[PDB]
Design an enzyme around this catalytic site. Sequence first.
Site, PDB file in Angstrom:
ATOM      1  N   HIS A  40      -2.237  10.581  14.946  1.00 43.03           N
ATOM      2  CA  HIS A  40      -1.393  10.159  16.017  1.00 43.03           C
ATOM      3  C   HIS A  40      -1.139   9.003  16.208  1.00 43.03           C
ATOM      4  CE1 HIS A  40      -4.320   9.422  19.195  1.00 43.03           C
ATOM      5  NE2 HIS A  40      -3.458   8.769  19.741  1.00 43.03           N
ATOM      6  N   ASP A  84      -6.912  15.413  14.047  1.00 43.36           N
ATOM      7  CA  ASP A  84      -6.339  14.082  14.273  1.00 43.36           C
ATOM      8  C   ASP A  84      -6.847  13.047  13.584  1.00 43.36           C
ATOM      9  OD1 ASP A  84      -4.531  12.174  15.367  1.00 43.36           O
ATOM     10  OD2 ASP A  84      -5.725  12.239  17.458  1.00 43.36           O
ATOM     11  N   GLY A 175      -4.734   2.907  23.531  1.00 42.69           N
ATOM     12  CA  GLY A 175      -4.725   1.587  22.719  1.00 42.69           C
ATOM     13  C   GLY A 175      -5.921   1.456  22.170  1.00 42.69           C
ATOM     14  N   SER A 177      -7.202   4.335  20.720  1.00 39.72           N
ATOM     15  CA  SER A 177      -6.661   5.617  19.797  1.00 39.72           C
ATOM     16  C   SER A 177      -6.998   5.180  18.235  1.00 39.72           C
ATOM     17  CB  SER A 177      -5.580   5.981  19.705  1.00 39.72           C
ATOM     18  OG  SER A 177      -5.286   6.707  20.952  1.00 39.72           O
ATOM     19  N   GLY A 178      -7.440   6.082  17.289  1.00 37.50           N
ATOM     20  CA  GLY A 178      -7.905   5.824  16.221  1.00 37.50           C
ATOM     21  C   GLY A 178      -9.145   5.033  15.816  1.00 37.50           C
TER      22      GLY A 178
END
Length: 223
Positions: A40, A84, A175, A177-178
Amino acid sequence: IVGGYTCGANTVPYQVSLNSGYHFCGGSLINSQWVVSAAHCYKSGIQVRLGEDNINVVEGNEQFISASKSIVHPSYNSNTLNNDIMLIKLKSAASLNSRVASISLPTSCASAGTQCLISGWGNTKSSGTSYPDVLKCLKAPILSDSSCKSAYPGQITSNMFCAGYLEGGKDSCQGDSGGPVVCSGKLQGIVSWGSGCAQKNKPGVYTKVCNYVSWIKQTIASN
Ligand SMILES: [Ca+2]
């Protein structure tokens, strides 16, 4: 990160910032040429920033390397956030040192109750908005499958796990994320999703990295 603490410069040397004119997602360095992040977080024109602490000041230990290729998981579902996970190849190899270092992939999956380290430059507020300049850290435990599925009925796949505090107040946020969830020195999770941040009975949901280690290894061996 909500309710976390200041990590300390370069104490999380596998943490990267993904930049497209501004920080927008975290990632993890898994060797000198590859970063793992969330599917995402996908966008074109990614620059990978290694060795960052304050993402708005050049402090001297940064390496800024453009991505040559992104590869979203073949089964990524952007509706459910199942699978994801994305790989990003750097145009050149990073120089590994005490401030820039890779994180090991898991050989086996982590256990409920294990305390893990989650990090990023995401929002530090529960309901308001404040983004930090320096890297934030959080210790949080993996929650039982049963409690995860109870929090998010009909939404949790076997490629996901919950970590955090059901009472609320401590969580990752937009922010982050990942970014990494590191347990017992291994990358076990990727910051994926949640209902708000740090809300009661809504813990963070993480991509379960141990399900993807075959795909990562074969993809890196061929690209
Ligand atoms: Ca910096």
